[PDB]
Amino acid sequence: RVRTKTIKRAARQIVEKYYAKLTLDFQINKKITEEVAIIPSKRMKNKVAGFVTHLMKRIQKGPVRGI
Amino acid sequence: KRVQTFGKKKTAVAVATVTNGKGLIKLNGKNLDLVEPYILKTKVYEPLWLIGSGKLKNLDIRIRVKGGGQTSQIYAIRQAIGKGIISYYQKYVDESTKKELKDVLLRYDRSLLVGDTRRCEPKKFGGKGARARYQKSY
Amino acid sequence: PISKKRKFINDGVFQAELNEFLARILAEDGYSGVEVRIRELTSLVQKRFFLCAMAQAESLRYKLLKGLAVRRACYGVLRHIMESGAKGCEVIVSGKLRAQRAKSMKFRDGYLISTGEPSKRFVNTATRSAQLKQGVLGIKVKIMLPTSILPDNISVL
Amino acid sequence: RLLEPVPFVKTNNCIKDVDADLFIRSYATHLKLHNKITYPKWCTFVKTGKGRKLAPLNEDWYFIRASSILRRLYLHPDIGVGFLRRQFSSKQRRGVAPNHTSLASGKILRSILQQLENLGYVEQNPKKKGRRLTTKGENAINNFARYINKKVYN
Amino acid sequence: YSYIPKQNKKLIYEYLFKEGVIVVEKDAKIPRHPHLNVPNLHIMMTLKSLKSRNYVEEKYNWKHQYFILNNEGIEYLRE
Amino acid sequence: IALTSKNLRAIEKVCSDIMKGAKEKNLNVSGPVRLPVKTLRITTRKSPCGEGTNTWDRFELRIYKRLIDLYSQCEVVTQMTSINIDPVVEVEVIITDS
Amino acid sequence: VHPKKYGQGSRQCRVCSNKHAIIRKYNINICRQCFRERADIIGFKKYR
Amino acid sequence: KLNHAVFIVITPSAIAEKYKVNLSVARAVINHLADSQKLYT
RNA sequence: GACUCAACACGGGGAAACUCACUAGUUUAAGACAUUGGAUGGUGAUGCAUGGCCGUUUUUAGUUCGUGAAUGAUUUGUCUGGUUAAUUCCGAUAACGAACGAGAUCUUAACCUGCUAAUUAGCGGCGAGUACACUGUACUUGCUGCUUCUUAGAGGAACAUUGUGUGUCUAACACAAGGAAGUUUAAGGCAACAACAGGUCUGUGAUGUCCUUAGAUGAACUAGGCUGCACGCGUGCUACACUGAUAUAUAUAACGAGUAAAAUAUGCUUGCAUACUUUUCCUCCGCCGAAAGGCGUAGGUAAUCUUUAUCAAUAUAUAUCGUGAUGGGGAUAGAUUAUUGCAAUUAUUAAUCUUGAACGAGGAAUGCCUAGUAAGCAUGAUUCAUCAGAUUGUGCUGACUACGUCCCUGCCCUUUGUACACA
């Protein structure tokens, strides 16, 4: 399924600005990203929000190369 | 009093009007036995046994059929009657038995409550079949 | 007494006539509106019945029909469309061009989105032909209107 | 085999509560005994439909037609000979050419309608243009249905 | 035969003068024009004649002509 | 009063204007009517010359028709429609009493 | 000359001026050859 | 080839094989003994 | 015209009168402009002059730029390796950073928003009940509580979601579960870089050049051919039967699509001229005739009328037969009645009867196939005055399986060898 450089760069751009707002819950991460970003495609917004969640669960247990 | 529910699988659609009465469950005019194929009569009869005759003796269910394939119509009828009995349990008769009814329903089968999404996909270009091609020569 | 579908078909063919007539007569100026000079156009329409890609393409078609250098004409019109504001423009010229061998040259500048329904919505098309000594020359003008906003763009403050 | 257990409460108030085929045969036999209508003689040399292309080989097809026309007339309040043809459509295998549907003959249904009109079972009115059963015909079919129902009951 | 009448010529000419915007149509077998009670067959040759005399101009289209009178034709064709 | 067009946003905006005007004028106005949409399908084939793999395209045009009813003078509603209408939208007027 | 209102000789295309391969659906009376490019201007979008 | 006749478990196929007769006359014999395919009685 | 994929049910090419580029013929100037000179038109040639369009390489994954770096064509980036819907990413990296293509994006279907309401629809109530249950039922005729149900006006819902695991613990995929939606949820459309000397100047008053024009290569009219056959080759339909051939009854849909002509009378002597409605679609009805079809009408320019509280079939069950080229099979011809068409002859189409061919499942060989999909069964639209055995769409019966690979074949990349570069 993977993803593209667009989603990778979007994930790198986000969180670095509003990390404290983002939590460990996938649904709340979706809701936060919904108003954090401005891209009007709901499907890839959901995709990138899931990307934010799966990147956030990589936090706090080792180096993550970013943020 | 009276409730209305719907059931849709394939092209066929079905409605279910659940009302109080003496046990008058009529498939429009023709009974639920004169359909002819006993093979599908068995599937018609399946939901009744898992619920009980006494519960349906107090309800009258009006069944309207409007076109569709032989299997699609009976499956839509099953969806409609399942939604109707669930709604009437949640509304008028009894809520405690509704939980056990839905539990045993989901235990036995899944298509009884919610139907399938399978439908005739628009045949593409290339062959008479939906995913076939015309024979090609050299 | 006409059915709605056949009425809309008649409206469509009438508007097709209108658009081809606009292409035929509108030569000296760009898009300045439509009517639902002007006196004679209204009279002829009544008697019969009873930035801009088109403008830029028309300008460059005039430039190439006048016999001026093709490279200079396309460079000038490309400067013009950049100065109008589009992120890029693609001009394709196909035909004789000094040789019996048919050839074509491409000019790359801008974003140049080339497929997808968002691309179709945000990018319009112009295509024409011109007569010359030994045939016709076909010109394709592609300008992308600056982007609602393009879905591929992602940016958060 | 023909009898099936019934868990819901019946009414038995009309012909809708009985099997179509068995009731059609029973009413055909009843009409045969009553001699209400003729065979008729002119229809012996004609097959049922153009698609059928041959004899019905049942020596009761006209009476089955007569027992089915009023059945469908009750089922649909207003219909006609065209609807009867569409209902009794069959296949017309045009030899090598692929099979297709074909409506039955209309004149035999027209003759059946004439016979029923003479019997008084059916009436024609400017309103409700499609054929409908008269009140006395409805009572007659109600009595016959409630009678055959009790016969097949016990 | 089909000799063109002088009355027809003068009538069509004064029609041009009084209207100024004329649609001649490419078809010739059409028996009559909606706004001209004259057989259409006697129109296109004289329109072509005026065009080749360079007194009128035509944009032309498929199944449409759209003749518009020029400023240098009325004075010559008035009589 | 019924309206017909092709694009959905135009009919939506004028329908919103219709309900706003009805609420402002306080008339005996029927509820919104949502007729099923009709798709008009045509078939065509590419490759004007017969050479090549013959391929076909499907072109669909989507109609949009809606209905409403009002109890008021015809002149005011027709003037409102004229001032707040698009030349690409066609409207017929039918009145109601009670 | 016997101009008849029926058959192949009854009508002709409006734009291409050739009655061959005329599609009469919706009484448009336009040739498909020109319709290929007139499909967008006619306003009849190609989606799928 | 067919060589069965009519002149001298009641299932049609079995009795047809037993009596070496056609199944139509076998059905006739079944009805005669008792007095389109149906389940066993 | 077109000849391997990438021609041969293709040129929307299902050709009875021009039609139609052909043939046997006959006519017209309809050759504009200033006898005479002199021009348009052309289904005439040239797709190896073109444009546009399209079919391929090619529905894959490749292509390019700025800077930098390594006499030159050039190389790098654009990659050892792991994953994949794909240079799709991670990652080591003389590369760093970018653009296109991929991606993404939307209609259909799919659940919810007891959101949004009722025209042309549904759920309801009662005014009367048609006969029966018993202390409403099938069905009508009239008004209106309401709009999940018939439908869409928008929005959300689905994101490997969660957990047990695989992974250089990064990029990934598996199992189970909530869930209509866990291979992107699936079918679609856009298709880059660039090319073929691929197809079309017979689609155009788009198109250069060459050619014809009065005994026309312009146009119009009659008839014929494209349908003829010693034969060969592609796409299809019907069958070779008993899960079959035949009749009878039940349960059945969607996309659909639908309105410059008849007849009458007058004058002349059936035809011409003249005036009145619209006869110029699907059609329900009542009959005429098995039928074809016709007669006078209901409805509708259209969820109202065809028609859709319903248009099909494979089924379903009982009955004739009972696997004998037979009753299977329907080629063939004969006898005909009706419509379409001023014209059915080369019997258009067609209800009926008669006629009764091969055919016992098909050698070398070959095509399509992963779930409402194979396969089988039907049906709407296209061109139609008439005619699908063609194409496309719609629906039904819902299967046998894989769940991966390069052994065949076809492409991609890397290395290597070239005396090939029209490769």
Question: Which residue from B24, B33, B48 is facing D4, i.e. has the nearest CB?
Answer: B33
Decide if G28 contacts C13 (C-beta within 8 A). yes
Q: How many CB atoms neighbour CB F47 within 10 A?
A: 12
Cβ atoms within 10 A of the Cβ of B22, count?
Answer: 10
Taking the CA atoms of C144, C145, C148 and C153 in sequence, report the sign of the dihedral they define.
Answer: positive
Q: Is D18 exposed, middle or buried (0-12, 13-18, 19+ CB in 10 A)?
A: buried
**Nearest nucleotide over every DNA/RNA strand to the E4 CA, judged by C1':** I30
Compute CA distances B31 → B16, B21, D43, whole Å. Answer: 15, 16, 36
Residue found under tokens 């000979």: D81
Question: Considering CB atoms only, which of D8, D18, D75 is closest to B23?
Answer: D8
How open is the CA angle E34-E35-E39, to the nearest 5 degrees? 70
Annotation-wise, does G16 bind a ligand? yes
Nearest to C119 by CA among C156, C84, C80, C152: C152
* Tokens at B103, concatenated: 């539990």
CATH of G1-48, picked from 4.10.830.10, 3.40.50.300, 3.40.50.2300, 3.30.70.20, is: 4.10.830.10
Give residues with Cβ within 8 angstroms of D93, minimum separation 6: D51, D53, D99
* Phi, psi of E53, deg, nearest 5: -80, -5
- Amino acid B88 reads Y
Residue E50: both structure tokens together:
């005026």
| Domain coverage including residue E56 | 1-79
Q: What tokens appear for D143 in the block? A: 């009595």
Query: How does DSSP assign B26-71, residue by residue?
Result: EETTB-SSTTS-HHHHHHHHHHHHHH-HHHHHTEEEEEEE-S--HH
Residue with tokens 């290929």: G36
- Residue recorded with tokens 């008084």: D120
Question: Are E57 and E24 a contacting pair, CB within 8 Å?
Answer: no
Minimum distance, in Å, between the CA of residue G41 and any CA atom of chain F: 13
CATH topology of domain B1-138: Ribosomal Protein S5; domain 2 (3.30.230)
Whole-angstrom CA distances from B7 to B72, B73, B76 are: 11, 10, 5
H or E element in which residue C132 lies: strand C123-132
Residue B135 DSSP one-character state: -
Cis? peptide before F36, omega within 30° of 0:
no
Closest C-alpha among B118, B54, B44, B55 to residue B81 = B44
- Nearest Cα neighbor of D51 from D89, D16, D80 is D89
Pairwise CB contact (< 8 Å): D8 & B38: no
Q: Do β-strands B59-65 and B13-20 pair in parallel, antiparallel, or remain unpaired? A: antiparallel
Q: Do residue E21 and residue C43 have CB atoms under 8 angstroms apart?
A: yes
Burial of B90 (0-12, 13-18, 19+ CB in 10 A): middle
- Could you tell me the domains of chain D? 1-154 (1.10.10.10)
d(CA C75, CA C82): 11
Q: Which residues lie across from D91 on neighbouring strands? A: D101
CATH of span C51-146 = 3.30.1140.32
As given in the structure block, the two tokens for residue D1 are 């085999």
Integer CA distances (angstroms), D37 to A15, C127, D55, in order: 90, 79, 21
What chain A holds in terms of domains, given with CATH numbers, is 1-60 (1.10.60.20)
Class of domain F1-98: alpha beta
Taking the C1' atom of I9, which residue's CA lies nearest?
B134
- Beta strands F64-67 and F56-62 are unpaired
E-state strands within C32-122 = 89-95, 103-105
- Residue C153's contacts (CB-CB under 8 Å, 6 or more residues apart) are A39, C147
Q: CATH code at E4?
A: 1.10.10.10
* DSSP summary character for residue C63: H
DSSP symbol at C91: E
Please give, rounded to a whole number of angstroms, the shortest distance from the CA of E58 to a CA of chain C. Answer: 11
Q: Where are the domains of chain B?
A: 1-138
Q: How was this structure determined?
A: cryo-EM
Nucleotides of I under 7 A from a protein CB: 1-2, 4-8, 10-13, 17-20, 29-30, 32-34, 43, 49-56, 64, 83-86, 88-91, 99-107, 109-111, 114, 116-120, 122-124, 130-133, 136-141, 147-162, 169-173, 178-181, 183-195, 197-200, 203-209, 220-222, 234-239, 244, 246-261, 284-293, 301-303, 307, 309-314, 316-324, 329-331, 341-343, 350-353, 366-379, 381-385, 388-389, 391-398
Structural domain boundaries in chain G: 1-48
How many domains does chain E contain in total? 1
| Sequence-ordered strand ranges (E) for A1-67 | none
Size of interface C-E (CB pairs under 8 A): 26
CB B41 within 8 A of CB B75: no
Cα–Cα distance for residue pair B31/C65, rounded to 1 Å: 83
| Residues A11, A67 contacting (CB under 8 angstroms) | no
State the SS3 of E10-61.
Answer: HHHHHHHHHHCEECCCCCCCCCCECCECCCHHHCHHHHHHHHHCCCEEECCE
The SS3 of residue C141 is: strand
Q: What is the CA radius of gyration of chain B?
A: 19
The whole-angstrom separation of Cα D82 and Cα D103 is: 8
- Name the 3-class secondary structure at D7: coil
Residue D144 CA to chain centroid, in angstroms? 15
